Amino acid sequence: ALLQKTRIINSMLQAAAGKPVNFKEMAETLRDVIDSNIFVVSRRGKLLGYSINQQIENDRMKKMLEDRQFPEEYTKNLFNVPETSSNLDINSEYTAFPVENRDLFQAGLTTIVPIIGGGERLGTLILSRLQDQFNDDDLILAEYGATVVGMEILREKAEEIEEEARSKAVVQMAISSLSYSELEAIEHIFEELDGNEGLLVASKIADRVGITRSVIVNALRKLESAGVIESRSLGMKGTYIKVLNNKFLIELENL
Amino acid sequence: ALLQKTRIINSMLQAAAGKPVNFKEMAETLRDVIDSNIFVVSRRGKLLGYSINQQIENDRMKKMLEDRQFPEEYTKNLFNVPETSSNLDINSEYTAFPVENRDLFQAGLTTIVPIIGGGERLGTLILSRLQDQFNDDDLILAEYGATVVGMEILREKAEEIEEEARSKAVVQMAISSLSYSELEAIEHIFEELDGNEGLLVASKIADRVGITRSVIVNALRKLESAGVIESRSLGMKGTYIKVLNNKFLIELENL
């Protein structure tokens, strides 16, 4: 039924497709397929997701869960595990962890799989059982699992930078197309405006600043047509604006 | 030794990391691990890579290889296989292929794994053997294999459109910065130039066309400053230019 088991993980990957990464979800699916407690811990050792199907009396663990994080101590110790290590209990004679960190295997069997992707140690996958051995098939699953979670940390962060940069880009591209006086205007406007939103009299700034209303508006138009702001007038004696690009205001500061 | 077999795939993936996707290589690695002929065919049914370890008398396939492509016929039929289909020979009674495409199984055992990733059917992985059956362990590997190829087809195509676009984008942005006269100049320059490279006398076009050297120059500057072209003079009685943006010439046409 192993083929089938891997097939699940396959479909769970295929499923997460266009949808924001959910670690808790993945944690569960693994928990189910491999039949073990599942813990997903970042490079920096932060707890990213987890799922439990058997209670295991472990202080260090419970504390870590409460903390949603590992102490630097362990975090490092963990990162230093270079490859899958399996079936570690408190009796395990081995290298990976120094004596005073063995409280991690206080009870039950633990397996450590590094999460590697995009040529980086991305984090670590922790599995624990009360007493059932991790045989090879388990390991296969666990490893495939970690591999998949890898690809998600990647998708996750990749999506992240694409947004950040794209938005910034667009702002710049828009700003670029401003005349001196247009930009001059925009600057004065948001110098005047009280953050993300608010309204002002276009025709008033025009006098106050020494720039035709016609261009002030024009400038607004450009920003709007690039989708950075949203503007609606109120039969003048008012015109109102909200920014729709979170990077915009910051970028504007940089000049 | 299955675990080990998967682990190869694993490190093959991890290996491809920062390096340009190569399908022939992956083909080989899978050929090796699965112990079967491997062919990687796109959504559009193009041949992407392949590797052979055993000769099989199959005209349809030899033909396909020569063509580096399938006929729309098969391409379609292939795409319609919704999930892994295994050990299909000429005698197989089943649904997947209409009997006029049976010539596909002319000889030996064929197995088809759809390549799915990022929520799309990305292509198809085809494996063939002269007579050894595909057991589950093979299918696990073959499927893990397809999966890996997946994220690569993705990466490859993604990188592809990121370059295409970015180039185009920057051309436009640079064009955007030009005066009527400046642009007019550019246009006559490349109308005069014979493709990607060559030289002319700036001062000559100036009279020929009715635009000051001074601006013709400055137009070139602008382009260069944006990294579109590369310009070096030769103490006049010559100035020389090379386009560094493959999209630029094309875009220019579109005006």
Domain residue spans in chain B? 1-169, 170-255
Q: Which two tokens stand for residue A141?
A: 């699953």
Nearest CA in chain B to A140: B3
Contact by Cβ (8 Å): B169, B199: no
- CA atoms of B182 and B113, how far apart (whole Å): 56
Residue matched to tokens 């192993």: A2
A226 shares contact with chain B (CB less than 8 Å): no
**Are the Cβ atoms of B140 and A177 closer than 8 angstroms?**
no
Residue matched to tokens 């670590």: A124
For helices A2-16 and B136-176, the axis angle rounded to 10 degrees is: 20
Question: Length of chain B, please?
Answer: 255
Contact by Cβ (8 Å): A111, A84: yes
How is residue A34 annotated by DSSP? Answer: I
Please give the order of strands across the beta sheet that includes B239-243: B199-200, B239-243, B229-233
**Are the Cβ atoms of B10 and A151 closer than 8 angstroms?**
no
How is residue A69 annotated by DSSP? Answer: B
- CA atoms of A7 and B249, how far apart (whole Å): 49
Give me the long-range contacts of A59-68 (CB less than 8 A, separation at least 24).
Answer: A59/A103, A59/A106, A60/A103, A60/A104, A60/A106, A61/A104, A61/A106, A61/A128
Phi-psi region of B237 (alpha: psi -120 to 50; beta: other; left: phi over 0): left
Contact by Cβ (8 Å): A113, A143: yes
Comparing C-alpha atoms, which of B148, B150, B155 is closest to residue B13? Answer: B148
> Which of A5, A6, A121, A180 is the best residue to mutate to test the B interface, defined by the most B CB atoms within 10 Å of its own CB?
A6
Q: Which two tokens stand for residue B221?
A: 């500057």
What value, to the nearest 5°, has the Cα angle with vertex A75 and ends A69 and A78? 125
B8 shares contact with chain A (CB less than 8 Å): no
Could you tell me how far CA A219 lies from the centroid of its own chain? 35
- The beta-strand segments (E) located in B158-217 are 199-200
Residues 6 or more apart from B43 whose CB is under 8 A from it?
Answer: B79, B120, B121, B122, B123
Contact by Cβ (8 Å): A142, A127: yes
- Would you call A40 exposed, middle or buried from its count of C-beta atoms within 10 A (0-12, 13-18, 19+)? buried
Q: What is the dihedral of CA B202, B207, B209, B213, to 10 degrees?
A: 40
- Cβ-Cβ contacts under 8 Å, A176 against chain B: 173, 176-177
- CA atoms of A126 and A30, how far apart (whole Å): 11
The answer to whether the annotation marks A105 as part of a ligand binding site is no
- CA atoms of A35 and A120, how far apart (whole Å): 27
Comparing C-alpha atoms, which of B106, B107, B85, B87 is closest to residue B95? Answer: B85
Q: Which two tokens stand for residue B87?
A: 């050990």
Q: Which two tokens stand for residue B201?
A: 């006398």
Contact by Cβ (8 Å): A60, A106: yes
Residues 6 or more apart from A101 whose CB is under 8 A from it?
Answer: A73, A74, A77
B243 sits in which H/E element = strand B239-243
φ, ψ of residue B119 to 5 degrees: the values are 60, 20
> Which of A3, A120, A135 is the best residue to mutate to test the B interface, defined by the most B CB atoms within 10 Å of its own CB?
A3
How far separated are the first and last CA of chain A, in Å rounded? 62
- CA atoms of A152 and A137, how far apart (whole Å): 23
Q: Which two tokens stand for residue A165?
A: 């940069």
**Sign of the CA dihedral with B96 first, then B104, B46, and B11 last:** positive
Contact by Cβ (8 Å): A240, A198: yes
Residues 6 or more apart from B13 whose CB is under 8 A from it?
Answer: A147, B148
- Would you call B38 exposed, middle or buried from its count of C-beta atoms within 10 A (0-12, 13-18, 19+)? buried
**Are the Cβ atoms of A6 and B173 closer than 8 angstroms?**
no
**Residue A98, amino acid:** P
Distances in Å between the Cα of B217 and the Cα atoms of B171, B202, B225, B243, B251 are 18, 7, 12, 15, 21
Nearest CA in chain B to A141: B3
Residue matched to tokens 């699965």: B34
What value, to the nearest 5°, has the Cα angle with vertex B153 and ends B148 and B156? 125
Q: How far is B120 from chain A (nearest CA, A)?
A: 8
Comparing C-alpha atoms, which of A123, A105, A104 is closest to residue A113? Answer: A123
For helices A246-253 and A180-192, the axis angle rounded to 10 degrees is: 110
- Would you call A187 exposed, middle or buried from its count of C-beta atoms within 10 A (0-12, 13-18, 19+)? middle
* Method by which the model was determined: X-ray
Reported structure resolution in angstroms: 3.0
- The beta-strand segments (E) located in A57-184 are 85-88, 109-117, 120-129
Comparing C-alpha atoms, which of B117, B140, B199 is closest to residue B8? Answer: B140
The answer to whether the annotation marks B201 as part of a ligand binding site is no
**Are the Cβ atoms of A2 and B139 closer than 8 angstroms?**
no
